[PDB]
mmCIF file of C-alpha atoms in Angstrom:
data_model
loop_
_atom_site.group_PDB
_atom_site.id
_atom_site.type_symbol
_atom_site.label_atom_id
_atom_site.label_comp_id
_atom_site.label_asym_id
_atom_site.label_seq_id
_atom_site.Cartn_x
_atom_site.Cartn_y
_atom_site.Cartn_z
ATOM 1 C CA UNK F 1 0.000 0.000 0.000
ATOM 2 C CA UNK F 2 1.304 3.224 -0.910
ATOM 3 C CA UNK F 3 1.859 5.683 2.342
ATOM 4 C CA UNK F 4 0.823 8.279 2.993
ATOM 5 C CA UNK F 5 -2.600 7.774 3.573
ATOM 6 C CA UNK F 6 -6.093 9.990 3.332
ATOM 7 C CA UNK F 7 -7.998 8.151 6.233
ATOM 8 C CA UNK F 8 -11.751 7.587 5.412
ATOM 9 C CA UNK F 9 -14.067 8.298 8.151
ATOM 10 C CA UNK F 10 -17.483 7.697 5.951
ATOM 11 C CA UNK F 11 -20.353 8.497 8.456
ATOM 12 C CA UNK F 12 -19.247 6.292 11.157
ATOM 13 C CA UNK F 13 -21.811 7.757 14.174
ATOM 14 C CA UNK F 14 -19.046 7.223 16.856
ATOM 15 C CA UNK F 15 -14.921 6.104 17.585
ATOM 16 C CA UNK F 16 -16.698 2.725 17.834
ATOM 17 C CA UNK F 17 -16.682 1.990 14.268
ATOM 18 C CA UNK F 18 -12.834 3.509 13.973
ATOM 19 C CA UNK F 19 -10.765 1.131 15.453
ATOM 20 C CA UNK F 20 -8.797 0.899 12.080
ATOM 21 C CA UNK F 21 -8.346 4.648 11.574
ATOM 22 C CA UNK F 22 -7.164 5.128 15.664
ATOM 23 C CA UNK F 23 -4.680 2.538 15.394
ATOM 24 C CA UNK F 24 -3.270 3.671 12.279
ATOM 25 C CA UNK F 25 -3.023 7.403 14.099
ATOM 26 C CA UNK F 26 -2.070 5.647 17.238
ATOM 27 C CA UNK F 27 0.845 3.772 15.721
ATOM 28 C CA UNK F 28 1.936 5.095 12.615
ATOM 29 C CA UNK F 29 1.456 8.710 12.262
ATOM 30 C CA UNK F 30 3.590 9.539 10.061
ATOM 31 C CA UNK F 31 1.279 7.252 7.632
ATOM 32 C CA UNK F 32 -2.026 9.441 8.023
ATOM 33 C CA UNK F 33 -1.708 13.529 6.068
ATOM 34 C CA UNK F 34 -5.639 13.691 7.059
ATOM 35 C CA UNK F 35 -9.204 12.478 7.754
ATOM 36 C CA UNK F 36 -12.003 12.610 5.062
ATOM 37 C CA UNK F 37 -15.230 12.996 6.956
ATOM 38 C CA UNK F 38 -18.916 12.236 5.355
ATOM 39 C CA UNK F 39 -21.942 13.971 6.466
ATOM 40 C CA UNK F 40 -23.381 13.044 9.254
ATOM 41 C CA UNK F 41 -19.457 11.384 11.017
ATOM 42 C CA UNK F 42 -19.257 11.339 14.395
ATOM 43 C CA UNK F 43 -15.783 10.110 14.676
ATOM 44 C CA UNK F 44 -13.610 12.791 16.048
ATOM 45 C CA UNK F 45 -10.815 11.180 15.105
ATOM 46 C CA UNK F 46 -8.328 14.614 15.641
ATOM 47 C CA UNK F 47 -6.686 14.769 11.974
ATOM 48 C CA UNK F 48 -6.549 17.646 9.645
ATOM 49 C CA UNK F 49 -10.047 17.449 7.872
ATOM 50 C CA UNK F 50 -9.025 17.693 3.912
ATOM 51 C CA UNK F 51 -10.824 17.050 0.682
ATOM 52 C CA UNK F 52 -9.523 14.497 -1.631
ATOM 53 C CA UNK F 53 -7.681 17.745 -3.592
ATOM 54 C CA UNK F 54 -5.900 19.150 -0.464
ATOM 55 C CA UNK F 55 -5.019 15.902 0.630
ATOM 56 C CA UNK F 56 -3.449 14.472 -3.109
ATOM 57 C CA UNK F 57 -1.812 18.326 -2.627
ATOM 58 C CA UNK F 58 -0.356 17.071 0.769
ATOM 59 C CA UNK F 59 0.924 13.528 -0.581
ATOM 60 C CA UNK F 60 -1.494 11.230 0.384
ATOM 61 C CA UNK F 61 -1.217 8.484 -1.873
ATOM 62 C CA UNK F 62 -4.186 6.249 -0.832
ATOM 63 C CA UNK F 63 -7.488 7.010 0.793
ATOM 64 C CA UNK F 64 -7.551 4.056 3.373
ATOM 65 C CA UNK F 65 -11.374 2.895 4.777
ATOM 66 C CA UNK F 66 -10.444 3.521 8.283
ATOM 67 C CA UNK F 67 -14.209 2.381 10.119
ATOM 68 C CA UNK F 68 -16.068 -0.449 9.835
ATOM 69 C CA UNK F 69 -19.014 -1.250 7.311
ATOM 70 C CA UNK F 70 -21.383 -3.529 8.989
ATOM 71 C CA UNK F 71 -20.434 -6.906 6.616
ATOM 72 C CA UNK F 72 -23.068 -6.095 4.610
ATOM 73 C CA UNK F 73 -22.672 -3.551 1.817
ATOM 74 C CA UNK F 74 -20.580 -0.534 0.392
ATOM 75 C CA UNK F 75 -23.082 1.621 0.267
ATOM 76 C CA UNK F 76 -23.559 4.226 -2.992
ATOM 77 C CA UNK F 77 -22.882 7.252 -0.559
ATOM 78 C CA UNK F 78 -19.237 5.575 0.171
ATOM 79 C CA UNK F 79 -18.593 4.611 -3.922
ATOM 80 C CA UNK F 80 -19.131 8.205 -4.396
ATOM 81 C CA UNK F 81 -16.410 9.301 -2.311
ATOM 82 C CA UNK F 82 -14.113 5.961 -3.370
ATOM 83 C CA UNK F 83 -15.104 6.457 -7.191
ATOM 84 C CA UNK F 84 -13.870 10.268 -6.618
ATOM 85 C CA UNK F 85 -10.349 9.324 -5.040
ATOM 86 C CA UNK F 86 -9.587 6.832 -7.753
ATOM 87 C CA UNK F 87 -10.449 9.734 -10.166
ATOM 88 C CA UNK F 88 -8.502 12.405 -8.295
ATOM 89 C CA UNK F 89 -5.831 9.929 -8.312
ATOM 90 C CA UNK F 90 -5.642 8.080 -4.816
ATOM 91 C CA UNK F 91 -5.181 4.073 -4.410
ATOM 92 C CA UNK F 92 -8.254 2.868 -2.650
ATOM 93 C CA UNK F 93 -7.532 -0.017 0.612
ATOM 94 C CA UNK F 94 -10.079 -1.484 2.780
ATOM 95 C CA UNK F 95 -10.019 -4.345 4.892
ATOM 96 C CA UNK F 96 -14.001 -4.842 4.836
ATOM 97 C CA UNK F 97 -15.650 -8.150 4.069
ATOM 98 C CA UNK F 98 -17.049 -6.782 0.729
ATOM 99 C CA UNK F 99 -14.189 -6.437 -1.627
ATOM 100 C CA UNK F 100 -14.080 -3.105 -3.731
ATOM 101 C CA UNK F 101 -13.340 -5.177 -6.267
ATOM 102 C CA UNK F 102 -16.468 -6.966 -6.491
ATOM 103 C CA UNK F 103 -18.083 -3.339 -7.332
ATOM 104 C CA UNK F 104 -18.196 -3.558 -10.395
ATOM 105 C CA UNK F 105 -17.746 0.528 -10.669
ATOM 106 C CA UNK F 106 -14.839 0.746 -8.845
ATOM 107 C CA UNK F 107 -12.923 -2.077 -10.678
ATOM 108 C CA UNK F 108 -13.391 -0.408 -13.896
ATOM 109 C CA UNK F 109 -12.635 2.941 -12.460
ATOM 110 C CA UNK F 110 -9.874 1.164 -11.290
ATOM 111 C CA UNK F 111 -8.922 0.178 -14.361
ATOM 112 C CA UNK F 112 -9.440 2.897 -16.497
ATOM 113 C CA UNK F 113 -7.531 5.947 -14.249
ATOM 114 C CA UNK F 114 -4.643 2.985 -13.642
ATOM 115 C CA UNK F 115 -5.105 3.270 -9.926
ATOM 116 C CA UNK F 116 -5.011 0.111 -7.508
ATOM 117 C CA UNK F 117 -7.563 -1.331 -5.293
ATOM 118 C CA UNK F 118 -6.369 -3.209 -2.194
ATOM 119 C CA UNK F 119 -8.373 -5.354 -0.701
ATOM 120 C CA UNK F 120 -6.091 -6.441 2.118
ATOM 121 C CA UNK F 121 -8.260 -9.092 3.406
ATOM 122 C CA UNK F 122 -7.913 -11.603 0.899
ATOM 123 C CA UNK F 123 -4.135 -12.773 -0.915
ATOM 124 C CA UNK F 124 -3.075 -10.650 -4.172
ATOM 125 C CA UNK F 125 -0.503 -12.489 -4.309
ATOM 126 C CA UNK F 126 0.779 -15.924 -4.290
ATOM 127 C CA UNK F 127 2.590 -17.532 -1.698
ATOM 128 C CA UNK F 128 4.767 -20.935 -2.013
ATOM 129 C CA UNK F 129 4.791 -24.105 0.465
ATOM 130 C CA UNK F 130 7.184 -23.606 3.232
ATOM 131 C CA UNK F 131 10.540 -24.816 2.832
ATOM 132 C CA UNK F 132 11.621 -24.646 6.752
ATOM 133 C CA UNK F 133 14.996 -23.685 5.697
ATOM 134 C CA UNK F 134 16.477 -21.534 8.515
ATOM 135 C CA UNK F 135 16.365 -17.536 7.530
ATOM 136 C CA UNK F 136 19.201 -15.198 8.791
ATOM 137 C CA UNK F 137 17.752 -12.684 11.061
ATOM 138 C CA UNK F 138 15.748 -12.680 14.649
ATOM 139 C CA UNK F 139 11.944 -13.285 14.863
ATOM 140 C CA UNK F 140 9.664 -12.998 17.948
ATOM 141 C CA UNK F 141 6.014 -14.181 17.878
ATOM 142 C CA UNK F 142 3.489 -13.995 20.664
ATOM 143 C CA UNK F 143 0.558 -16.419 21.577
ATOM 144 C CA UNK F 144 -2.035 -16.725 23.372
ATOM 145 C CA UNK F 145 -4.421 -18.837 25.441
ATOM 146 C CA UNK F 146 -7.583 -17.470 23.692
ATOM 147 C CA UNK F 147 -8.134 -15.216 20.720
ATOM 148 C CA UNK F 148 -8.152 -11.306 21.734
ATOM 149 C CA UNK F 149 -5.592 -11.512 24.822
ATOM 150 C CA UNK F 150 -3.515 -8.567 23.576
ATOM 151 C CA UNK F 151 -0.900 -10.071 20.857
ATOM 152 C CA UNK F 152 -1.235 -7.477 18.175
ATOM 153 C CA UNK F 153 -1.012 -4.924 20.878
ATOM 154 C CA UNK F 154 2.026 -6.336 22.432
ATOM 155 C CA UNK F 155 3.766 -6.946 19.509
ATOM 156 C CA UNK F 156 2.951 -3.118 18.496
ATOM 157 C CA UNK F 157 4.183 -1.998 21.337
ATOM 158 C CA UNK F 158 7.597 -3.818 21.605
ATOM 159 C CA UNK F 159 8.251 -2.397 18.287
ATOM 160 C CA UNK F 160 7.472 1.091 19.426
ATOM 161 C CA UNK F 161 9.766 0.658 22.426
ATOM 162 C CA UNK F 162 12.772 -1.018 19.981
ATOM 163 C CA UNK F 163 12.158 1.605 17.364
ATOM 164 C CA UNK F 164 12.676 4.480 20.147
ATOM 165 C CA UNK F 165 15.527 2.374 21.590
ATOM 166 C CA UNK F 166 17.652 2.286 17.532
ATOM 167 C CA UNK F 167 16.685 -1.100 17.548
ATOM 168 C CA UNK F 168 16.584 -2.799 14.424
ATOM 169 C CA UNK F 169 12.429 -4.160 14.069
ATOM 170 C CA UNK F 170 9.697 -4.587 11.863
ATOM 171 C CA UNK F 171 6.071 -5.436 12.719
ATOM 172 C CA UNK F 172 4.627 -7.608 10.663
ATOM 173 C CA UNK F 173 1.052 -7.872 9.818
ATOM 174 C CA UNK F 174 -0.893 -10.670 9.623
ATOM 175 C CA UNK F 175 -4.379 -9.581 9.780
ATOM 176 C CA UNK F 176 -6.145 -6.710 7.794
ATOM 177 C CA UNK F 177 -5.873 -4.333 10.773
ATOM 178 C CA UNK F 178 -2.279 -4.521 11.058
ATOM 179 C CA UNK F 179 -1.233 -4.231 6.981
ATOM 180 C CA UNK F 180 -3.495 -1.092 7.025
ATOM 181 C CA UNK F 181 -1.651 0.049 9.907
ATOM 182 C CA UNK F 182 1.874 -0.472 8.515
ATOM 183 C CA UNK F 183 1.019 -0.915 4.479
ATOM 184 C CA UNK F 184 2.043 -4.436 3.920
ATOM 185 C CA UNK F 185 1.462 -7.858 5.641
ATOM 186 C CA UNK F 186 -0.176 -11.540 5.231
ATOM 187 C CA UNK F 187 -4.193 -11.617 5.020
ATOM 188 C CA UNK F 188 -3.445 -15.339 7.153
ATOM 189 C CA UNK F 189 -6.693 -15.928 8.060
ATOM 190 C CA UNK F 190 -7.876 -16.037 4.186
ATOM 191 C CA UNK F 191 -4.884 -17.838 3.259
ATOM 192 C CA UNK F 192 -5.288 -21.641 1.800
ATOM 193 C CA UNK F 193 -4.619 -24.389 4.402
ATOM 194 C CA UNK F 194 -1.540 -25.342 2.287
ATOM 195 C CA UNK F 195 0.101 -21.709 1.878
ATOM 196 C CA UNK F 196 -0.600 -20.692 4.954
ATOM 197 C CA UNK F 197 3.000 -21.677 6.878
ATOM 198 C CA UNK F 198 4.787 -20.549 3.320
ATOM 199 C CA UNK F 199 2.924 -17.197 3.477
ATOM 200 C CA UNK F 200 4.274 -16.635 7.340
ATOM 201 C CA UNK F 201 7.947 -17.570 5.654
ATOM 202 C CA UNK F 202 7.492 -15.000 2.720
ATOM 203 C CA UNK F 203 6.176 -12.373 5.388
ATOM 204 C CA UNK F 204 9.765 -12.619 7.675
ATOM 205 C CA UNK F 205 12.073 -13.146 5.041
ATOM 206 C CA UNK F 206 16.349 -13.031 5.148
ATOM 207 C CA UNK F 207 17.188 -10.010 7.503
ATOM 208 C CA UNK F 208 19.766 -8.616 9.127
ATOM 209 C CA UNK F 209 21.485 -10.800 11.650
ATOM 210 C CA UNK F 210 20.337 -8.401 14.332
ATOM 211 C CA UNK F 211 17.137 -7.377 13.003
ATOM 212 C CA UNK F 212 13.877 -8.285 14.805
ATOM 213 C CA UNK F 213 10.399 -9.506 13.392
ATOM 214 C CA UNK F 214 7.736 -8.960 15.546
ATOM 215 C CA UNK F 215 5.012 -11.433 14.321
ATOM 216 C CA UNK F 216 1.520 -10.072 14.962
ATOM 217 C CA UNK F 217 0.240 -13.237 16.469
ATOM 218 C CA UNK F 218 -3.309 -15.177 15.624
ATOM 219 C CA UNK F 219 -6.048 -17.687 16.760
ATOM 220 C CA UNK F 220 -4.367 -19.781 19.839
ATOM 221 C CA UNK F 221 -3.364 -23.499 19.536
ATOM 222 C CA UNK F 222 -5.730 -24.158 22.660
ATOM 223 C CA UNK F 223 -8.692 -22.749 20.041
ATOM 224 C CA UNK F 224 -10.393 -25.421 17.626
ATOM 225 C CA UNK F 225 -11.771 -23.263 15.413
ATOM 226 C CA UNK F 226 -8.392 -21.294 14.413
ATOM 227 C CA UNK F 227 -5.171 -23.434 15.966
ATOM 228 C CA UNK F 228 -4.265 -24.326 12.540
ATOM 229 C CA UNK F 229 -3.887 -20.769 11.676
ATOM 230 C CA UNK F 230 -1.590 -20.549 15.175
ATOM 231 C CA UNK F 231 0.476 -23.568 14.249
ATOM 232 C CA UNK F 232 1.330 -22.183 10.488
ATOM 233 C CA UNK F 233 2.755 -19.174 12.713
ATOM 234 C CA UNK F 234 4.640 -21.376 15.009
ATOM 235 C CA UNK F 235 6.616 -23.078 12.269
ATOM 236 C CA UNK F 236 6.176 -20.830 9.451
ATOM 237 C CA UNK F 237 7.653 -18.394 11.633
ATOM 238 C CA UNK F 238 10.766 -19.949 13.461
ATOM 239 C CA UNK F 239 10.326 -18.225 16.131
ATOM 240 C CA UNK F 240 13.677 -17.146 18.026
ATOM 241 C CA UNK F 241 11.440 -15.659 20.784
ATOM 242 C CA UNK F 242 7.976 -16.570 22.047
ATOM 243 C CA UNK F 243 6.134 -14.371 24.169
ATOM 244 C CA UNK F 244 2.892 -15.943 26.318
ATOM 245 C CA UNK F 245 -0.332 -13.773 26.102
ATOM 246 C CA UNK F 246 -3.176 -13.757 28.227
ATOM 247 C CA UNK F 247 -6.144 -12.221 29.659
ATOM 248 C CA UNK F 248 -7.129 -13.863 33.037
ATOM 249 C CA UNK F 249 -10.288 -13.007 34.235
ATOM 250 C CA UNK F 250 -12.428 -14.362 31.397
ATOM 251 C CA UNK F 251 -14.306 -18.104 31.710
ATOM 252 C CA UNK F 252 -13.843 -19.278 28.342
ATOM 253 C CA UNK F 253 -12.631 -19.507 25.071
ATOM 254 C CA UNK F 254 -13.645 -16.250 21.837
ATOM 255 C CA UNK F 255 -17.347 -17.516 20.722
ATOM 256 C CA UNK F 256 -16.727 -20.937 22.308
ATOM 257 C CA UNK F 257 -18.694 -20.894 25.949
ATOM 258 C CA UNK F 258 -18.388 -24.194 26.718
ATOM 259 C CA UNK F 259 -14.720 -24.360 26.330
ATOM 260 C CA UNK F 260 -12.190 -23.747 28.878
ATOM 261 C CA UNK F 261 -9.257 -21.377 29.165
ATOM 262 C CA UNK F 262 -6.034 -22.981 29.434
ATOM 263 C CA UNK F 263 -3.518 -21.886 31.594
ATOM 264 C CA UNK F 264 -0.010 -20.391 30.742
ATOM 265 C CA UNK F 265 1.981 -23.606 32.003
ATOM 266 C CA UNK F 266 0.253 -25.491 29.384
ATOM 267 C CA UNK F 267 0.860 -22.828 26.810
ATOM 268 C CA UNK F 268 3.944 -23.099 27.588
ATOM 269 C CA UNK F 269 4.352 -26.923 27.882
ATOM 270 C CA UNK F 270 1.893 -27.174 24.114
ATOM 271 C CA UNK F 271 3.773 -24.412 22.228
ATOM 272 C CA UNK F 272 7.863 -24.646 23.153
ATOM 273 C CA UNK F 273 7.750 -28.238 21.800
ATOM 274 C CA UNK F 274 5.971 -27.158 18.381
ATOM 275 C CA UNK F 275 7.970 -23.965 17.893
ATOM 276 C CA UNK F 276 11.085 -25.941 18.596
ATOM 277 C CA UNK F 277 10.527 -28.129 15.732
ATOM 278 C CA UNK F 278 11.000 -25.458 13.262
ATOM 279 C CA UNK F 279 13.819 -23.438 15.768
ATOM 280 C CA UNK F 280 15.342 -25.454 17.585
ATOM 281 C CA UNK F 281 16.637 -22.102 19.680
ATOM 282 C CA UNK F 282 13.391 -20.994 20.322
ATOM 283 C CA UNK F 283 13.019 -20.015 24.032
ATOM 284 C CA UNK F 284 9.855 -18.271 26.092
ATOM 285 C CA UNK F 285 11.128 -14.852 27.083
ATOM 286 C CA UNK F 286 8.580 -12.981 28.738
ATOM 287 C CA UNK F 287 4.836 -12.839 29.279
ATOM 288 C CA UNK F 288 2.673 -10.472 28.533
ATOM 289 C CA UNK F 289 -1.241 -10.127 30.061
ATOM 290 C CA UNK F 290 -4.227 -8.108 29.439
ATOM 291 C CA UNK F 291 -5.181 -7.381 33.483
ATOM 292 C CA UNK F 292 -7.190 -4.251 32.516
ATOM 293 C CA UNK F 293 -10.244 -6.288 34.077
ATOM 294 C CA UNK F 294 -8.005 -6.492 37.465
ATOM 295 C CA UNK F 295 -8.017 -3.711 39.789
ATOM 296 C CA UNK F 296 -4.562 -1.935 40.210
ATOM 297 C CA UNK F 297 -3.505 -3.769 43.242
ATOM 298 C CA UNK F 298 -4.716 -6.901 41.759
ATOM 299 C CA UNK F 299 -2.973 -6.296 38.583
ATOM 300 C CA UNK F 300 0.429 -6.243 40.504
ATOM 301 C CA UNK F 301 -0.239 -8.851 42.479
ATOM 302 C CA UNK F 302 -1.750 -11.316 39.572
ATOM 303 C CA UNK F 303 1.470 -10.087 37.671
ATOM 304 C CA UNK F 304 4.081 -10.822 40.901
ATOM 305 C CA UNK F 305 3.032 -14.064 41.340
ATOM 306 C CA UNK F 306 2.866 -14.928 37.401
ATOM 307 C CA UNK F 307 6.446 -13.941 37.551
ATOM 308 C CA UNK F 308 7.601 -15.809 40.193
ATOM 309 C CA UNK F 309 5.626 -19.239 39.352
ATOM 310 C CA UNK F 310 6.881 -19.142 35.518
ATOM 311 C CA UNK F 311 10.468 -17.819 36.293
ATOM 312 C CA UNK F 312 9.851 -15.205 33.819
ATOM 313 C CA UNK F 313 9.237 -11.064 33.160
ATOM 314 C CA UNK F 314 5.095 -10.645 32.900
ATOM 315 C CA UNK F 315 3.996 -7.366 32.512
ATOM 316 C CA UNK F 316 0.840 -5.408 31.280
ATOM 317 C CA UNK F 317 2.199 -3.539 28.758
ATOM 318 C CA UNK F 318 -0.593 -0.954 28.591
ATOM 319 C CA UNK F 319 0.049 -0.229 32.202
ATOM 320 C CA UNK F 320 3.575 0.107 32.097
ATOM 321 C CA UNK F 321 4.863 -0.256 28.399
ATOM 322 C CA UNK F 322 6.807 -3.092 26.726
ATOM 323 C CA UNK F 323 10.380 -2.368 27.561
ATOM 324 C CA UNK F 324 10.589 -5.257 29.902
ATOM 325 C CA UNK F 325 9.608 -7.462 26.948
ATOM 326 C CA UNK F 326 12.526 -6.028 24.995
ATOM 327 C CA UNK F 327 15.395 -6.080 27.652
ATOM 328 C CA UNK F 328 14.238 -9.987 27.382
ATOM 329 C CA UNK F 329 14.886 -10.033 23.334
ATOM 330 C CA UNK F 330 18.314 -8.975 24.135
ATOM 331 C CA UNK F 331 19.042 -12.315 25.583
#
């Protein structure tokens, strides 16, 4: 995806529907000239407020569907504003269930002004069957217990912290939220069963012997709807580092309420072995849980005794920042 970005708003009523648009501002700034705003937006979202014209005249190379649709349909009120980019000469990329590309008027707009649609959701391009063959450079990947325990954000934040610290990193995207926040990245949930480890491998290529991937993580092995996803991680990317992710007060599994949560000693005892197989380096470093749903005094206690039970650093990295789970890299 060409940066710098316009950042559609549409007429999302609230910062509810913005969650793509805030993290993009939240994490990569420097990737966001503006906000487009329809009638009727509620989402304050703080950018400069530009029209496709001031913004192409600021260097925004793609207008970038920063809120959420519903799953449903792009409505005519949004294809007037898309079909207008394309025209004024912006890339359009959305990471909506409905592909711009099934609109049949913005795929031949598309086509005609010789501007791009990404549709980040789905592949564009093909990836091969792994090969396992080891790849110079470091790679970190975090997982979870459950889905949603705080792996994209902890994997965002370590390579804030390592980017401030002259650290050689690059996150790397493996959902539609995170290659809209950074530009590039590996749709892995839409990937085919069979392309899914080589797709991880073609997303953390040969680096720099001290260069650092920080794998945005997905599903968890301990969830049978998506551990296959979490296993084409694990080996696809031979993980150096693991971090364990977790959110404790919650009774079960994402969408599965009759499942259990396991607990981070079997994380630990499931994962090592698997990551192993494809690194056989691969060591847990640090731990990183979700205790916003912990009051303060609970948080430090949950995390003090983590620590001491799993001889290793656990830390909420909202409430005090990631650089614990970076001195732990360094090792």
């Amino acid at each position: 995806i060409e940066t710098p970005y316009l950042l559609f708003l549409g007429d999302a009523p609230d910062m509810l529907a913005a969650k793509v648009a805030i993290g993009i501002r939240d994490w990569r700034p420097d990737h966001a000239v503006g906000q487009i705003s329809l009638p009727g937006c509620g989402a304050n979202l703080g950018l400069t407020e530009m029209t496709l014209e001031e913004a192409k005249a600021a260097g925004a190379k793609t207008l970038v569907i920063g809120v959420a649709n519903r799953g449903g349909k792009i409505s005519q009120e949004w294809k007037k504003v898309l079909v207008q980019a394309l025209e004024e000469g912006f890339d359009l990329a959305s990471g909506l269930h409905n592909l711009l590309r099934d609109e049949p008027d913005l795929a031949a707009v598309a086509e005609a002004t010789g501007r791009t649609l990404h549709d980040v959701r789905v592949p564009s391009v093909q990836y091969p069957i792994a090969d396992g063959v080891k790849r110079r450079g470091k790679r970190c990947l975090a997982v979870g217990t459950d889905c949603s325990v705080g792996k994209m954000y902890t994997a965002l934040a370590m390579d804030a912290e390592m980017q401030a610290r002259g650290i050689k990193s690059t996150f790397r995207a493996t959902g539609q939220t995170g290659i809209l926040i950074t530009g590039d990245g590996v749709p892995l949930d839409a990937v085919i069963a069979d392309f899914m480890a080589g797709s991880i491998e073609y997303l953390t290529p040969d680096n720099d012997d001290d260069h650092w991937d920080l794998i945005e993580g997905q599903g968890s092995l301990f969830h049978v709807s998506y551990s296959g996803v979490t296993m084409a991680l694990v080996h696809g990317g031979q993980p150096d580092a693991l971090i364990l992710c977790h959110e404790p007060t919650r009774t079960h599994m994402r969408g599965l309420p009759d499942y259990d949560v396991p607990s981070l000693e079997e994380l630990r005892d499931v994962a090592l072995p698997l990551a192993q197989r494809a690194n056989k380096d691969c060591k847990i470093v640090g731990i990183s849980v979700n205790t916003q749903h912990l009051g303060e005094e609970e948080a430090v206690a949950y995390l003090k005794e983590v620590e001491g039970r799993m001889g290793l650093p656990a830390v909420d990295p909202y409430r005090h920042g990631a650089g614990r789970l970076v001195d732990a890299l360094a090792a």
